[PDB]
Ligand binder design. Sequence first.
Ligand SMILES: COc1cc(OC)c(-c2coc3c4c(ccc3c2=O)OC(C)(C)C=C4)cc1OC
Ligand SMILES: Nc1nc2c(ncn2[C@@H]2O[C@H](COP(=O)(O)OP(=O)(O)O)[C@@H](O)[C@H]2O)c(=O)[nH]1
Ligand SMILES: [Ca+2]
Ligand SMILES: [Ca+2]
Ligand SMILES: [Mg+2]
Lengths: 426, 61
Amino acid sequence: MREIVHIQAGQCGNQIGAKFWEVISDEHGIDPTGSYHGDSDLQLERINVYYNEAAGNKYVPRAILVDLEPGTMDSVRSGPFGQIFRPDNFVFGQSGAGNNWAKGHYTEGAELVDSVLDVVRKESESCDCLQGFQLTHSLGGGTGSGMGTLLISKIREEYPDRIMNTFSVVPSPKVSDTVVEPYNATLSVHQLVENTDETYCIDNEALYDICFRTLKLTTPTYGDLNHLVSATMSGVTTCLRFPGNADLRKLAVNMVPFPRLHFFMPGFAPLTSRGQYRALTVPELTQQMFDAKNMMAACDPRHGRYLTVAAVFRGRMSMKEVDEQMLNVQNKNSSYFVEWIPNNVKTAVCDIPPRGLKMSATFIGNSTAIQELFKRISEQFTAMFRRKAFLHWYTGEGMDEMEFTEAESNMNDLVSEYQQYQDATA
Amino acid sequence: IQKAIEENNNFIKMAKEKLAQKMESNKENREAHLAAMLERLQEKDKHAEEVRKNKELKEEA
Ligand SMILES: COc1cc(OC)c(-c2coc3c4c(ccc3c2=O)OC(C)(C)C=C4)cc1OC
Ligand SMILES: Nc1nc2c(ncn2[C@@H]2O[C@H](COP(=O)(O)OP(=O)(O)O)[C@@H](O)[C@H]2O)c(=O)[nH]1
Ligand SMILES: [Ca+2]
Ligand SMILES: [Ca+2]
Ligand SMILES: [Mg+2]
C-alpha cells in the first residue's frame, strides 16, 4: 500500500482541492458520506492511495485542509462533498494573509504551521508505505503561496526521503486579485525549485485563454477555470488510482533529468465547458493534446524542446492506434524533442473513462518552453521591484529587499538553465 | 519575525517618546507665556503704587 497524503492550502488550494476530491470520489464510487456504491472492483484496488478505510465501510480522504482564514473552509464543509473530510483535518487560523507571502511564510503562517504538521504526522503514521505528498495551492496569494511553501520546507525536514509534488496555480493579470502576485509567485517559485520533485504548473493565464477563445466563454469564472483543473488532476493521477507499476518516485525518475527542471506543462483533451455527444478519435486526442491551444501553461512548445513527455489516454480504445498516433505526432514535431534522451515519450491507457466523456487524454510535458512562464512572472516582478513598489507590505513583516533580490536572481538562473538545454544537441 | 517585532516595538517607543517631548515643551512654553503676561501685569501694579506714593508727596507741600 503506497499511500499519498494530500494537503490543500489557501483559497485556490482548497477550491481546486475540493473539486479534485469530488471528481475522483465519483470515479471511485464514493458518495458524499464516504460510502462506496460502485459497480466495478477496479474502483477499489487502489482506493487506498488517496483514501483511508474507517469501520462501517467508510472511505475518508487522506486530506488535510489548511487556511489562515476560515471563510473558504466553511464553504468546503458546506460544499457537495464537505462531509467526507475528516473533521480534525481542518486546520485554520483567523487572521488571513492579505495576499502577502511574508504573512503566510514568516508571521501569520509560522504561528499555525506546527498544528498542520501534527495532522500530517498523524496521517503519515497510519500509512503502510507513504509514497509522498501532494499540495494544491496558488502562488499569487499569501496562504497557499507563503504558508504552503513553508509547509513544504517543514515537511522535507521531517520526511526528507519522501516525494513532495505540487499542483501550483500561477497568477495572471487576466485573472488577478492584487498587484503583488508577481512578488508572491517569484518568492514561491524559488522554494518550489528547491523542495518539490514535481510541480504541475497550472497557469491561470492559459486557463483564461482556453475558456475565452476555445470554449467561447466570454466571462470566465473561477468555476470555469477549475473545471479544466479538475479534469487534468483526475487525468494525471489516473495511473496512481487504478492498476497500471510506478509510484511517485518512479514517475519522477523518468520525468526529471535535472533536479531543478521539474516544472511540467499540463494539458487535456477534449477541452470542455461545464454542461459532449461525439467521442473524439485517437488521432484527435493526440493532436489536440500537443497543440498549444490545449496547453494549460501559457507557453509555446514550439519555442522550446521537450525533455520528457507523458500522456495518459482514458477510455476503451486501441492501444495499437495509440502507439501509432503517438509515434506519428513525434515526427511532425520531431525537432521539438531533445535527441539526447532516447525514447523520452511514454504513454499509458486506462479503460475507465472520466465522468461524461468516453475518450480523453491528459498531457504532462517537461518542456524548456516553460521558461516563458517564468520570464513573464519575472518581468512583472521587475516592473514593480525597480521602483520598490508595494514592498512596504513585506518589509512591514520583517522582510528585507535582499530576499527579493535573491528571489529575482534565483528565478533568472532557472530561466537560463532552461535555455541551456533548449540549445543542447547530440 | 524577530525583526518585525523589533520594528513595531521601536515604532511604538519612538511615537510614545516624541509625543512626551512635545507635550512637555508645549506645557513649558504655554506656562512661560502666561507667566510673562502676569509678570507684566504685576509690573503695572508697582507702577500704580509708585504713582499713588508720588501723590502722597506732592500733598506734603
Ligand atoms: C504532484 O502531482 C503529480 C503530478 C503528476 O504529473 C503532473 C504526477 C504524474 C502522474 O502520472 C504520470 C505518468 C507518467 C509519468 C509521470 C507521471 C507523473 O508524473 O507516465 C506514464 C507511465 C505514461 C503514466 C502516467 C504525479 C503527481 O503526484 C501526485
Ligand atoms: N484557478 C484559480 N485561481 C485562484 C482561485 N482563487 C484565487 N486564485 C488566484 O490565486 C491568487 C491568490 O491566491 P488566493 O488563493 O486567492 O489567496 P491564498 O488564500 O493566500 O492562496 C490570485 O492571483 C488569484 O488569481 C481559484 O479558485 N482558482
Ligand atoms: Ca496572532
Ligand atoms: Ca509541536
Ligand atoms: Mg483569494
